[PDB]
Amino acid sequence: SLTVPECAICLQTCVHPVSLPCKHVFCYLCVKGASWLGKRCALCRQEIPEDFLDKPTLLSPEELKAASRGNGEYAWYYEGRNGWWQYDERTSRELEDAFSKGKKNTEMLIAGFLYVADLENMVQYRRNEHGRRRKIKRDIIDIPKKGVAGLRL
């Protein structure tokens, strides 16, 4: 397929598609979100390795490297331990849209939970519990970073 495969969980084009041992493909963050519920492969019920979120098999690792240098001028980042993580490309488009329109905030689905992005104070937090807080920023692509959306680089 010349096109990026569709994810059977969210019904969108896969973002950071990962391949399970059974060879089904899903967004990394949809797999992560389904892990909170203890799910197996959504399509065939076969096991997802215990360490999959820490060492996922990427459908195209080269495309991750390209994402971490890909959107040209600017990117969005969220706070990690001793460094910044880059937002996934789909959430980044939502943030950019909201920011560019002057919205004070917007909501994002990230790995099975709704987050508020507070664009006035540049912080994100889980909508249900405001204590889970991470600083965000909108900076150039060429900075040091931990990875993209939890995927190491």
Binding site: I9, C10, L11, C30, L37, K39, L43, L109, G112, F113
Partner: protein, 149 residues
Amino acid sequence: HAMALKRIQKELSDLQRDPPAHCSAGPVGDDLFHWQATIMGPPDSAYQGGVFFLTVHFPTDYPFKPPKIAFTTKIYHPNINSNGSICLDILRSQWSPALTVSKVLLSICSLLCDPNPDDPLVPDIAQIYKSDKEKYNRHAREWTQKYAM
């Protein structure tokens, strides 16, 4: 249950934009986990001209489990009983998250056109389907007129 909610919202938007033939669906008020649906009996089916009302309820871990879909309108059919339960493999073990309510609705329309007597939820009706098809069609049309028009 935000994964389910967003998946359901996406299906709704896609359905209301390009609705399946013979079908209508939408949420009950502001509650995305409960929908109502309507099927107009397919042309050339024995159910033609019938209006059938259905209920859809989504599980909190959707799309990992299928929606619960039932007929609220009485119908004469080997795969649909008086409680409105629908005997269809993709609402049981053959559910896949690759499917949508839209696709289930079309499969239900397909079942109306071509019942499956080898999955006999209503045995008496299934036997008539197999032994006397003209009688089956007569009864299905009679019940359509009586209960669904």
